[PDB]
């Protein structure tokens, strides 16, 4: 039941978003809406994701399977 | 006073507790070695009852019997606790916290006892003219756990203008030390 990775999907856009949330979304590797990337589970990725929880849809690899 | 242990709260559990109809609080005494404080949540009916029949800023002159209730080894618990600094609101005057102190029958707890003023109707100074002012209402002093005094009755049968009741002379129960004794400040004055 160990969370090996996370799957992060944009549900919002880039327009109207402040530049620092925009930079966090850039460094997560998300560019377009409805785009899902697979991210590791370490404290760096979790810090990036906790900065922007209202713009993304996070899900566990087991959940996505 | 039915309460529950309230494991982990900040300011968001407290807003949800207040919406759920509960009032938070804690008991702090170091009963066993360090303080081992216990967080608790009461109800607005219980807290309103204490602040109505005993009043706010008073109510610390009694040792209420707390009831630790589960929401058996879970539904058991009764502690002797004394109120300290009930947290009222300054707009709607609702009460948001209790902060009680555990008060076993032997204790050196500080108690803020009120002033009841025994004989306002009869005094020579009050009937020459006017009334009497009460500057130091609720004089606080040390007490014992099993003998906390609910009321302090200052004797006002014989006071006149320029005759003041000082904090130094007050009814002192046995084993109940006055906290501030070196001061000579006017608790009562016949101001006209």
């Amino acid at each position: 039941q160990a969370v090996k990775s996370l799957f992060v999907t944009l549900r919002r856009g880039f327009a109207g978003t402040p530049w620092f949330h925009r930079r966090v979304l850039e460094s997560l590797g998300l560019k377009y809406r409805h785009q899902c990337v697979e991210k590791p589970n370490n404290s760096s990725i979790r810090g990036m994701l906790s900065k922007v929880p209202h713009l993304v849809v996070i899900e566990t690899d087991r959940m996505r399977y | 006073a039915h309460v529950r242990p309230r494991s982990a709260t900040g300011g968001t559990a407290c807003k949800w507790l207040r919406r759920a109809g509960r009032v938070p609080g804690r008991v702090h005494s170091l009963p066993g070695a360090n303080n081992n404080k216990l967080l608790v949540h009461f109800s607005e009916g219980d807290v309103a009852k204490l602040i109505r029949t005993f009043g706010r800023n008073g109510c610390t002159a009694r040792v209420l019997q707390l009831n630790l209730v589960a929401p058996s080894g879970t539904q058991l618990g009764m502690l002797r606790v004394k109120p300290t600094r009930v947290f009222v609101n300054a707009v709607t005057q609702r009460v948001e916290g209790l902060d009680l102190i555990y008060c076993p029958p032997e204790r050196q707890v500080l108690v803020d006892v009120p002033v009841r003023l025994l004989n306002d109707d009869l005094a020579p100074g009050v009937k020459k003219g006017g009334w009497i002012a009460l500057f130091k209402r609720t004089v606080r002093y040390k007490a014992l756990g099993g003998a906390i005094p609910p009321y302090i009755e200052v004797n006002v049968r014989n006071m006149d203008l320029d005759q003041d009741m000082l904090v130094r002379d007050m009814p002192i129960p046995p084993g109940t030390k006055l906290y501030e004794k070196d001061y000579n400040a006017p608790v009562l004055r016949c101001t006209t």
């Binding site: 039941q1 590791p40 589970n41 370490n42 404290s43 994701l49 906790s50 209202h54 | -």
Partner: protein, 97 residues
């Protein structure tokens, strides 16, 4: 938003028009997604394996093009004995193979 006066109609003459149930349904859906995001973050923090997972990433396009340019300018800047020297150890590797 939040303007009643000033000649520009950002609102009706009444200073707003409050939330229809469609708007409240949309805000409830978005808040539910945000709550599941931070709950999933707490669960992933509490269930992270020791020696965490590294995923395979390729070189980005900038390193890739830079290092292909660098490798192509190694190829022009090689000495005369070099490809025979590489071929000798290439043969010697597969004699031991």
């Amino acid at each position: 938003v939040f303007k009643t006066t000033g000649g520009r109609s950002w609102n009706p003459p009444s200073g707003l028009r409050p939330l229809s149930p469609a708007q409240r349904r949309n805000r409830t859906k978005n808040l539910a997604l945000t709550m599941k995001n931070m709950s999933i973050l707490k669960l992933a923090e509490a269930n992270q394996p020791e020696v965490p997972v590294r995923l395979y990433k390729p070189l980005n396009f900038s390193r890739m093009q830079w290092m292909k340019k660098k490798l192509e300018e190694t190829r022009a800047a090689l000495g005369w004995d070099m490809e025979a020297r590489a071929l000798q150890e290439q043969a010697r590797a597969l004699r031991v193979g």
